[PDB]
Amino acid sequence: SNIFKLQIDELLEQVKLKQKHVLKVEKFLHKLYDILQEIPDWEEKSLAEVDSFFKNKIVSVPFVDPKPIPQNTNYKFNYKKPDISLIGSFALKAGIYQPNGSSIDTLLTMPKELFEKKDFLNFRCLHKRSVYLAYLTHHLLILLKKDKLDSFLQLEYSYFDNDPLLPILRISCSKDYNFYKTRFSINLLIGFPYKVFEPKKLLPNRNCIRILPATPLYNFSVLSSSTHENYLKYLYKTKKQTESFVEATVLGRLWLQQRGFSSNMSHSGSLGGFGTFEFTILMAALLNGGGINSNKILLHGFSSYQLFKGVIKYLATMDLCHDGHLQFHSNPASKYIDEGFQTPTLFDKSTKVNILTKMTVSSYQILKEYAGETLRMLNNVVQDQFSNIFLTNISRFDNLKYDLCYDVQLPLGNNLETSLAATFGSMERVKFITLENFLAHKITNVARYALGDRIKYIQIEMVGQKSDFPITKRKVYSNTGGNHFNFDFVRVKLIVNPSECDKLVTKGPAHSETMSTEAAVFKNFWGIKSSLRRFKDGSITHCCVWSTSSSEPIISSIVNFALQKHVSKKAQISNETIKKFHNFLPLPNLPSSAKTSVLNLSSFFNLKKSFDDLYKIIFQMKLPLSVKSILPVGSAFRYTSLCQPVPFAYSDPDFFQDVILEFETSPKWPDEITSLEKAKTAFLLKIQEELSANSSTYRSFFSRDESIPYNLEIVTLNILTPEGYGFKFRVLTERDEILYLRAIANARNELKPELEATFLKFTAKYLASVRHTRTLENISHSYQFYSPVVRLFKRWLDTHLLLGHITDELAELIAIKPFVDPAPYFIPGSLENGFLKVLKFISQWNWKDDPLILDLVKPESERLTLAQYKGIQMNFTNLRNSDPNGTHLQFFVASKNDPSGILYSSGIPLPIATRLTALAKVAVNLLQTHGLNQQTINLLFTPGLKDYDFVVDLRTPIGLKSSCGILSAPSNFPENLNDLSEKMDPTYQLVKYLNLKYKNSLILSSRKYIGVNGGEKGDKNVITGLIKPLFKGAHKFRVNLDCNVKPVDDENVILNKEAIFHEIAAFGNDMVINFET
Amino acid sequence: LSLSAGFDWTASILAPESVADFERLLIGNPNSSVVWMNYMAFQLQLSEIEKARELAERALKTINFREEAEKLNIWIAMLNLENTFGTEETLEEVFSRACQYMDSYTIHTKLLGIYEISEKFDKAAELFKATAKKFGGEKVSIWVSWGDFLISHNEEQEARTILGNALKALPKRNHIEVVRKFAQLEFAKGDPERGRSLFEGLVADAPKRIDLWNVYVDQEVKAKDKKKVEDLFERIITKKITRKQAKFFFNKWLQFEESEGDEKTIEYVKAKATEYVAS
Amino acid sequence: TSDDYVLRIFAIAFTRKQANQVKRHSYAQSSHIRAIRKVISEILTKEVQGSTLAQLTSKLIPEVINKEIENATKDIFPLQNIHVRKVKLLKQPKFDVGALMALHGEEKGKKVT
Amino acid sequence: EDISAMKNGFIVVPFKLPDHKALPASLHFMFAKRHQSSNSNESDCLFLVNLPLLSNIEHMKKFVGQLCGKYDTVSHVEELLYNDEFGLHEVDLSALTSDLMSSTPRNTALLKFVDAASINNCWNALKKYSNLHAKHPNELFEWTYTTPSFTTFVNFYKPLDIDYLKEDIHTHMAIFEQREAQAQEDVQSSIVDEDGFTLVVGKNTKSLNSIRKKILNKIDKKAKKDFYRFQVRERKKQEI
Ligand SMILES: Nc1ncnc2c1ncn2[C@@H]1O[C@H](COP(=O)(O)OP(=O)(O)OP(=O)(O)O)[C@@H](O)[C@H]1O
């Protein structure tokens, strides 16, 4: 906890506003107040007279829709000197430095004589306020010219917190009084006196627009405008009692901003309605109670951290919207009431103002989710989470913040079509003041009802909405809107539920003799798509049935049908980014493949079934030693194979799945390493012999293994199942491990590091591989999208020629990080969302100074403890002491299975490690500069190939795409198993042996999966090379150059590139076609 | 267009005068002890003796295990570092550790030079004794070098004792070589008369070893005692010598005399050779 | 287990007499019994921890655990009738439908008219 | 092209590269020097640096045969030692783990000849051959790159012959068992030194080499603080 407190103080001072600028602005608006009193008074006017007064002036009155017509505007208009005062964060001295800039809220209370008791009705107070503002802007403007301030002041109208009913005047300074360097803007809020209108008439249930429906949004604007200084005194009072108020405020402000929360209206569509003001009022209210027993939740002695944690815990746990609400008195213990008003409510009995009216239900749920996720981070003890809670901005990309985003182009966009506009009407104009508020609620309700349990949270954004307009205009002008609708288009952003997003059937109400109300709404909503169906259990229910596709999710269809039916038949809904990511996953050549969802693992289960059949056969065999266990370890057994298993598709590099065969303990094993392996092979020979006899439908053959260095006697048994799958069997013996340790001990002290590398590759394959597949298979069921993303990430690594050096396990462990450590984001719920979160992590990973250590567990045991965590931290620091620059080891990936951290990330050349980091950084920048769209995604998956020194083109004799099991094909294995080679791609083996030979001078890379990345026929591959910087120049001749060189002088030699090309060319024989250097 | 990024060999995406300069050099040239030693020398010049030690440890691991010559440079560098800036115990540890990794005999040789250059004769004398006990029975260089050390310090009687110890420990086949080189040491650095006595006994035991006569006269010619050279030459030609070897000494005798420059002596040896030519 | 299933294993074993034994009984000293018990507990803990519940079940069926116990206790004292007597499931993780579906290896209705 | 020999003594031995349709008079340059060593197996050898790819003995037999015909010389190459192109055989993993069955630079090898008459004869053909590049580059020899050994290496995905594999396992296990049996008799056969010292060998021990390794691998608690009169006096001293 002590570490946290020092971290806060570093953050507080870093964002602290420089005191010089506070004086610089305070020198200005102290002079600005003088100008306001210079403004003369005015006489009563009718709308005809004020219209004439402003007819020729550049200023125009910002009348709020509906603008007053001559018939209904019978009341008169007047101006009088206000009561200038300062409110907001600046009054409370709780602001911070913001590079984008801050605002100083200056309040001008209209004198009470200007208002009648019944002016809270029919926009009467609003239209008087507007002419008051316009008249002030007129005389204020000329006085600026008189004082020669107009040179560097820019004046514009704006809506206070995006509230269409409350236009204001903003004074901004362009490049002595010039406060441009302060990065401030002064807001001129025209408020009403306190308690002018009876607050009981302004309650949310009451009405104030005559057409009867309630008008909560209208009531809030008028009532809250009369309550500004009142809440300044309330916060000013609490600021004294508790000494950590301001520190707790900025922590809340910094919390909110990174989440993209504002104090603006959410009803127009934006995410907001809860800002620093609302957070401060909630904190202050809890300091005077807050429990169901009205007991205090916060104490005036709490520190900055404890005040912040108390408010967050309140938001996370106590429900303020559906079942429960909190009431307090600003002028009386605050009490939590169980009855809820189905909308966020923080009621104020003293002022009758609901502080959370600007807060929608949809964004309140996201806030309750964000608060609950940091409370978990805030209760965390093993890891430090200060950066995630405060120093990480998650609102930069919506795609990283939301699983699926749909753009809805509404028709006829210089006004919306008649049918769409007609739906607005007068009844809703009373409830939803503006058309955008009405569609934001309409899009939300139809999209929420249609999707239902398929999503968790929904946001509707009005893209391209403006809130500031010139002083010469009355309302905001949008290019597409033309003063009719202030937006370009709608974006529907969703947080999906992976467990049940891709259901084939949308269940509805159960059948009954008399159609219930629920069943009536279900059928009216869905129309022809609805149906009555019966299921195996015998229930009868109303439901509608959709069709899965491999290219898009079900939710894309549901939203499109529901929006066109209920919003407008001419609407265009399109999400093409998700469709590309789906098409980048290879499409298997299985029955009904194109109709299969990307969350379907049936192909993986079918292979597991054929293994179980082979599993039974081996156990019933009679051998000299009983079979202890048969453990499958291949990629397909953890659902990570890039290409889904297909029967008889033996061109796939992942066709033969590795299986560890283990016998009972014996003391008769040979005590030499080579004899032990030949003892193992004798067991495989008997298995093949008896399997060939009893089970003739199975075919088998023997292959050599050279993965483990210097152990040249390993032989594996390859079994070809009649179902059409391949399995590779290797024997594991208890004597294996201790003979390798014996070799290390007996080695010369110079050779010991070389032998330890052999032991490392032995344990990565035989010992750790079993633990890895076990854990990764189990958790993947809890992370439904982990398998499609890790496959697509491996597809991405292969396009850029990085899989040849990155082991598959390292790719899987990097790809799981967004799932097991999702903070500050949510767990990925889309193939697009998950993939880009992986690229974002690699982009920002400083692997030289930070380790990656994973808690491979299902979501809230095998959690890492503080003792184990520090132990792994110590392993990183010790490793970096000897290798500070990261030349030997770049990626430190550790977990319970691998506490050492070097098991899967050893042996990667540095240029490949930085190439992975370089490409991820370039990919993220490309997304920032150009949004995610059709063109950028193609760039993500097309390789450079110009950065390498030379590139070699290869073509296989036959296209391997069909035999690899990819749908743009064999149906049995060859009669001669030597014929299997004729349909393989050897270029991966060529690069491997070349890298061993030219390790000192060259780095060669290629594509492992030729059928996926080899074009239409899957026959084109490329070998890209890299000359190390040393041998690129000339060197003096010496015996230990260990490079293929040509003479230039008697004691000078240079790399013989042409000779190398002939050697690379003569490997592939016919395969090599072309060279580019 | 494509997703392209320039290849980085220094992790920059993430003469030498500074730590960064040396580390940057070591990125591409990890197997160069010269870069490593210079970096260690830089830290020592900065008085960071503790920082220099860790850098030596990193060099021992970073440098490829097959680069035995470069590894030797670091071990020698550590020995010099501990000797100059360390204590007795730490120098013993590195010296003990170095023998484990490299050829123990070679490390013994280098520290002896390190003591000699540092003018620590007392510790050198102790180390000649210890290395001779372990390696004296197989290595003749120790006895020659240890005899060189004693002769250089005007210790003749001890040097005679060490040669006796050398003969006792060394195999019989190396008895001629050790005595011959010690005699050469006496001519160059010690008492030439002692060197003559050693050769005289050597040729007495092995008269047929004509190469030894060639070495002995070479020392006499180098000493420029012409009378002893002339007397020796007449002795050699009265031995079991082949015709081919006879011309070699008669030529060398003539070549030596023309170096002296007395034409009559060249005339005499020509007559001396001429009568032997008749025989 | 690795799946967070807390379970209790019970193992039972009996001493046996050798082929040429002439004593009527085959009693073991309490030191042997403690030694055998320590070996059995070490094996039972190892097998369960490094395995899932489904994998542990696959070990119970072929009685491979018992053969492992027999080999480990061979040098201490000859034994017979080595069995994993009982398995209790004390605690369970949160139920996961996805894991259950995979362990067993969705269906649209049919229109009612 | 005028360079015929490097001053350190390595003779340049150019070779003409083959024609490949992907590569439309490029040369490969091999450096050679006499190898001297008292060791018998390394005697009569020629040190070679920068060998072409996958250069087996059959490759050198072709090259030397061409030199023999061109210069009318008799030279026979016995074997090519220490040819480790990919570094697979850098360490003998069998020798580190046991002494039974195994009593035991890069881009270089040793070419051994049948006799000194052959190796010296070859050097002169090489010395003449090196001069050709400066004068007549056209008549430089061409290295084939294709041999039966090369073809087998290229065919990576070839199943092993079970019949050959069975014999390989059978013979190796047979030899190994004889060596274990002989080793076990040696340890447990009443080893007595010349001085009548009998070695202690435990039961189940299988090799003397394993006894030696176990050797290489491998009063205060009984003392009383208060038993002697001087100890209590010392305790008396510190008490005050
Ligand atoms: N939800 C709300 N309910 C009632 N009044 C509000 C609400 N939000 C803002 N106000 C009024 O608006 C005034 C200024 O609002 P604003 O959000 O700009 O203040 P702030 O939180 O101090 O500023 P900032 O976020 O720029 O630091 C507040 O003093 C209060 O009078």
Ligand SMILES: [Mg+2]
């Ligand atoms: Mg403000």
